[PDB]
Design an enzyme around this catalytic site. Structure first.
Site, PDB file in Angstrom:
ATOM      1  N   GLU B 160       0.827  -1.221   0.000  1.00  0.00           N
ATOM      2  CA  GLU B 160       0.000   0.000   0.000  1.00  0.00           C
ATOM      3  C   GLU B 160       0.856   1.264   0.000  1.00  0.00           C
ATOM      4  OE1 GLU B 160      -3.636  -0.472  -0.224  1.00  0.00           O
ATOM      5  OE2 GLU B 160      -2.629  -2.224  -0.946  1.00  0.00           O
ATOM      6  N   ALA B 161       2.043   1.193   0.585  1.00  0.00           N
ATOM      7  CA  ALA B 161       3.005   2.281   0.509  1.00  0.00           C
ATOM      8  C   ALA B 161       3.554   2.420  -0.914  1.00  0.00           C
ATOM      9  CB  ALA B 161       4.141   2.028   1.481  1.00  0.00           C
TER      10      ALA B 161
END
Ligand SMILES: *[C@@H]1O[C@H](CO)[C@@H](O[C@@H]2O[C@H](CO)[C@@H](O[C@@H]3O[C@H](CO)[C@@H](O)[C@H](O)[C@@H]3O[C@@H]3OC[C@@H](O)[C@H](O)[C@H]3O)[C@H](O)[C@H]2NC(C)=O)[C@H](O[C@@H]2O[C@@H](C)[C@@H](O)[C@@H](O)[C@@H]2O)[C@H]1NC(C)=O
Ligand SMILES: *[C@@H]1O[C@H](CO)[C@@H](O[C@@H]2O[C@H](CO)[C@@H](O)[C@H](O)[C@H]2NC(C)=O)[C@H](O)[C@H]1NC(C)=O
Ligand SMILES: *[C@@H]1O[C@H](CO)[C@@H](O)[C@H](O)[C@H]1NC(C)=O
Ligand SMILES: OC[C@H]1O[C@H](O)[C@H](O)[C@@H](O)[C@H]1O
Lengths: 261, 247
Positions: B160-161
């Site tokens: 997700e980063a």
């Protein structure tokens, strides 16, 4: 996927100083002029976009009124523009007449200012946010060595400092006219140098100029499209306390930025 | 394999890792007006997985398989053992972690499925270096009662980063402050809407940058911001790549 081919969408257009694109007095006559005006929910600030490249408020079409610069943008009957290509919006928010190349412009910042079709020079006064949410976006701006831009020297200069969450001067207000404003004094804009013998990026009274128009690109740079250049840490050295306008290069990391909001 | 170790987990290192992860995932990516790379699609199963190694405080290592089509985990290896989500492409077994003892986790690689099975949500699951470290450990031994939250942690801290600079930056702020955190509405709203933003962005091409539908992205003051076009810096300077959605 019919979702890939949306038939239309209704939104606002906000620009200079956070004001909105507005059909003056909601007048519906062919050639009724469009103006700058404080944003609200009124029908005549509602712009419906379509696949045909038309932008509509009150059932009529946003248009230029002249092949040459300086004349008002208006709404007219859309039937008249039946054989024209219409509007193209650049990814930086420049709203352009495809044919004439003229662009939606606000020659002053005050309410009721006539929007005119002008020659494109990438000024902030030519930068539009198309979007229902018209408010400035409050953010920290993170660059080299994970430090934050801070407004300094009584809001006259700008450079990197270690990020501190409370810290007032590290907060920036991102306006719809592509300006980057001191959160705490939104008359003050981040500006490329006006002295040609310096590249130093500074803070100055907002004036709609090319120097104050910034673009957060997908590639992580903060671009001044008019000067085909990007915001950069002097010599890739944060301790120099200097941010300059440079051509886009991959030589260091100083041209890379993140928005934290 | 691209690698991130506990023993060398600075802000700079983490940042290079996420950067290199984006590069790899975006090889052969298509591009629209927005300029945000769109992940490859209908990729042959033999080419569909990208391997990453994570190493914890014991000098111990798992290798996760990322589906290059959707930047999600499909499966991982620990020593001679491997674990596939039931969600995984059904042929992935024949292509990755071939000579290991393959196992099927009885849930999908989605947050919804993972939160149901683990009984715990992202909002109540801490993120930080030692959570990264411990998540790896739990996965290495495959302790079943920690496997879900381990995935919540690692998915968010890696995948997700990679998807969102905002999220990257929460992990950086965590590394530098030496402070754990749980995701707030801002981070969750990005996770929630990755797919939908990809769709709207690609669809926006036919309406001068304007979406067919608005997407609510919270800020750090928990205020909702309606993104109904491509002209928001919080999208454009955040979302690093998209799911393929429209021809
Ligand atoms: C914001 O837009 C509005 C809407 O167009 C502007 O309002 C108008 O201003 C025009 C002059 O710039 C007026 O045209 C003139 O009207 C008088 C009346 O007979 C005439 O004596 C003038 O010569 C001129 O007539 C034109 O002559 C030149 C020909 O090429 C042309 O065909 C003739 O029409 C116009 O009537 C007026 N319309 C309205 C609805 O008010 C407005 O212009 C600014 O304020 C106006 C009211 C006037 O003071 C202008 O001088 C002034 O520039 C404009 N605002 C700004 C700041 O530009
Ligand atoms: C974009 O600019 C062009 C050129 O100024 C406009 O074209 C003229 O449109 C009017 C009204 O339809 C016609 O009467 C003229 O004959 C056209 N002239 C030329 C040179 O084509 C066009 O209408 C503008 N369109 C928009 C959406 O602003
Ligand atoms: C997993 O995903 C499938 C579709 O791939 C869906 O039908 C199902 O509800 C999900 N099942 C689990 C185990 O959550
Ligand atoms: O005077 C300008 C003003 O006219 C009316 O009040 C309209 O409702 C507003 O949107 C604005 O255009």
């Amino acid at each position: 996927n019919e979702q890939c081919s949306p038939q239309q969408r209704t939104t606002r257009i906000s620009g200079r100083d956070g004001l909105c694109v507005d059909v003056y007095g909601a007048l519906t006559a062919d050639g009724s002029r469009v103006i700058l005006y404080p944003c609200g929910q009124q029908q005549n600030q509602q712009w419906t976009f379509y696949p045909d490249n038309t932008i509509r408020s009150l059932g009529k079409c946003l248009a230029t009124s002249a092949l040459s610069s300086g004349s008002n943008v208006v709404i007219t009957n859309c039937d008249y523009l039946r054989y024209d290509d219409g509007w193209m919006v650049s990814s930086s928010g420049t709203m352009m007449n495809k044919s004439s190349h003229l662009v939606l412009t606000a020659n002053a910042a005050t309410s009721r200012t006539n929007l005119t079709g002008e020659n494109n020079v990438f000024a902030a006064k030519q930068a539009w946010r198309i979007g229902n949410y018209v408010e400035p976006i409050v953010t920290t701006i993170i660059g080299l060595r994970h430090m934050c831009l801070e407004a300094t020297d009584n809001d006259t200069n700008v450079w990197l400092e270690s990020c501190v969450k409370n810290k007032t001067k590290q907060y920036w207000a991102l306006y719809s006219d592509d300006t980057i404003r001191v959160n705490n004094n939104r008359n003050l804009c981040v500006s490329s140098s006006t002295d040609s013998s310096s590249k130093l990026i500074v803070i100055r009274r907002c004036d709609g100029s090319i120097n104050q128009r910034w673009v957060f690109t997908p590639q992580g740079t903060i671009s001044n499209p008019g000067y085909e250049a990007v915001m950069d840490v002097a010599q890739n050295d944060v301790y120099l306390k200097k941010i300059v306008l440079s051509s886009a290069t991959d030589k260091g990391n100083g041209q890379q930025w993140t928005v934290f909001y | 394999n691209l690698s991130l170790s506990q023993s060398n987990f600075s802000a700079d290192t983490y940042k290079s890792f996420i950067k290199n992860l984006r590069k790899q995932l975006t090889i052969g990516a298509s591009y629209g007006s927005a300029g945000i790379p769109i992940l490859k699609h209908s990729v042959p199963i033999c080419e569909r997985f990208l391997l990453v190694d994570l190493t914890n405080g014991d000098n111990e290592t798992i290798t996760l398989a990322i589906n290059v089509e959707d930047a999600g985990f499909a499966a991982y290896r620990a020593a001679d053992r491997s674990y596939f989500f039931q969600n995984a492409p059904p042929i992935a077994s024949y292509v990755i972690f071939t000579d290991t003892n393959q196992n099927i986790m009885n849930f999908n690689n989605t947050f919804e499925s993972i939160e149901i099975v683990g009984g715990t949500t992202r909002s109540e699951t801490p993120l930080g270096i030692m959570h990264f470290e411990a998540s790896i450990f739990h996965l290495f031994v495959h302790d079943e009662n920690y496997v879900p939250t381990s995935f919540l942690v690692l998915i968010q801290m890696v995948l997700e980063a990679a998807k969102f600079k905002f999220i990257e930056q929460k992990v950086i702020h965590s590394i530098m402050d030496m402070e754990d955190f749980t995701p707030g509405l801002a981070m969750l709203s990005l996770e929630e809407n990755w797919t939908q933003l990809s769709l709207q962005l690609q669809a926006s091409e036919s309406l001068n940058g304007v979406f067919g539908d608005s997407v609510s992205l919270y800020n750090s003051m928990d205020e909702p911001i309606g993104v109904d076009s491509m002209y928001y810096p919080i999208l454009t300077a955040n979302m690093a790549f998209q799911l393929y959605q429209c021809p």
